[PDB]
Enzyme design. Structure first.
Site, short mmCIF file in Angstrom:
data_model
loop_
_atom_site.label_atom_id
_atom_site.label_comp_id
_atom_site.label_asym_id
_atom_site.label_seq_id
_atom_site.Cartn_x
_atom_site.Cartn_y
_atom_site.Cartn_z
N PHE A 1 96.76 24.51 93.56
CA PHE A 1 97.85 23.86 92.86
C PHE A 1 98.36 24.87 91.84
CE2 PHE A 1 97.50 19.33 94.13
CZ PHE A 1 96.43 19.48 95.00
N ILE B 1 101.30 24.98 89.15
CA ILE B 1 102.38 24.34 88.41
C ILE B 1 102.74 25.12 87.15
CG2 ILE B 1 102.93 22.35 86.96
CD1 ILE B 1 101.14 22.32 90.39
N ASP C 1 90.97 27.08 92.27
CA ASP C 1 91.99 27.25 91.24
C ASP C 1 92.80 28.50 91.60
OD1 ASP C 1 91.36 25.06 89.56
OD2 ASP C 1 89.73 26.19 88.62
N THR D 1 76.65 20.43 80.97
CA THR D 1 77.67 19.68 80.25
C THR D 1 78.21 18.49 81.05
OG1 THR D 1 79.50 21.14 80.97
CG2 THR D 1 78.36 21.70 78.92
N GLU E 1 85.92 17.82 86.96
CA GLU E 1 84.63 18.48 87.13
C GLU E 1 83.46 17.55 86.80
OE1 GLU E 1 83.84 22.72 86.25
OE2 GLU E 1 82.86 21.96 84.44
N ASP F 1 82.89 35.21 86.27
CA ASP F 1 83.79 35.69 85.22
C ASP F 1 83.07 36.89 84.63
OD1 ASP F 1 85.21 36.20 82.85
OD2 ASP F 1 85.80 34.11 82.66
#
Ligand SMILES: [Hg+2]
Ligand SMILES: [Hg+2]
Ligand SMILES: [Hg+2]
Ligand SMILES: [Hg+2]
Length: 263
Positions: A59, A61, A129, A163, A221, A244
């Site tokens: 996606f 946008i 993503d 988390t 998530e 990352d």
């Protein structure tokens, strides 16, 4: 269902683990995909003989359409090379989609922002993503009915540190003593049927939360983690699949950095 052809490759030693530094299988016997655990030649054979088609959805946008060029170009170099691929780019700026040269057997659809379509066009769906880039091989070794990806910042943490949503008032609630792993909302997939079941489930749960005036700590998530806790993935991808380097460097435990965040 056809048989594989004669193939020549080194024998695997039964009395020799493939990796002695990481867990390569979950308690429910789902493999955890690390470099060294698979022979890509054997897997490519199995999936090509099935003429497997993989759908890749993103996606993009607003300002995120700017990440499409690099995303698509690197995917062309590392994502399912050799197999049929159908990219689905959901965007609010159809005209801003970069014209990327695609290899044979690969196509791209631009959907402006039809589930029935998926069942008819691809065998598997991979959802990621857009603000990322492929840096190494990401192939059929990930394909399975349902898979989640280990979040790069929590693969070595205790579950209490995960988390997860900790409020009982939320449908994504997961108590301190529960949980297998902390999965990423940015990289999951599987068969079209299993993926649609997951998204349909998370959509309903988020609506319930909305009506109840609550929003999960990490949104989608948080719900994906609740879903995968209750419906065990048939394969789990190691952090190799979403890393990352800027924030985590390059640990010896990672032989390859395949899909990463863009600085
Ligand atoms: Hg998707
Ligand atoms: Hg869910
Ligand atoms: Hg959702
Ligand atoms: Hg979800």
């Amino acid at each position: 269902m056809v048989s594989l052809p004669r193939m020549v490759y080194p024998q695997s030693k039964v009395l020799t683990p493939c990796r002695k530094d990481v867990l390569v299988v979950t308690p429910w016997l789902a493999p955890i995909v690390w470099e060294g655990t698979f022979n890509i030649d054997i897997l490519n054979e199995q999936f090509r003989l099935q003429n497997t088609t993989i759908g890749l959805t993103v996606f993009a946008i607003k300002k995120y359409v700017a990440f499409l060029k690099l995303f698509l170009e690197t995917a062309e170099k590392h994502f399912m090379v050799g197999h049929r691929v159908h990219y689905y780019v959901f965007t609010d700026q159809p005209a801003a989609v970069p014209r990327v040269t695609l290899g044979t057997g690969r196509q791209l659809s631009v959907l402006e922002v039809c589930e029935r379509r998926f069942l008819s066009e691809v065998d598997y769906l991979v959802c990621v993503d857009v603000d990322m880039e492929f840096r190494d091989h990401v192939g059929v070794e990930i394909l399975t009915p349902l898979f989640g990806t280990l979040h790069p910042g929590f693969y070595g943490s205790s579950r209490e540190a995960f988390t997860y949503e900790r409020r009982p008032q939320s449908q994504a609630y997961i108590p301190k003593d529960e949980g297998d792993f902390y999965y990423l909302g940015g990289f999951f997939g599987g068969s079209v049927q299993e993926v649609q079941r997951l998204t349909r489930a998370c959509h309903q749960a988020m609506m319930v939360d909305q009506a109840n005036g609550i929003e999960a700590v990490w949104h989608d998530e948080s719900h994906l983690n609740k879903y995968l806790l209750r419906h065990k993935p048939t394969k789990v991808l190691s952090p190799e699949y979403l890393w990352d380097q800027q924030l985590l460097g390059w640990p010896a435990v990672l032989r390859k950095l395949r899909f990463t965040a863009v600085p």
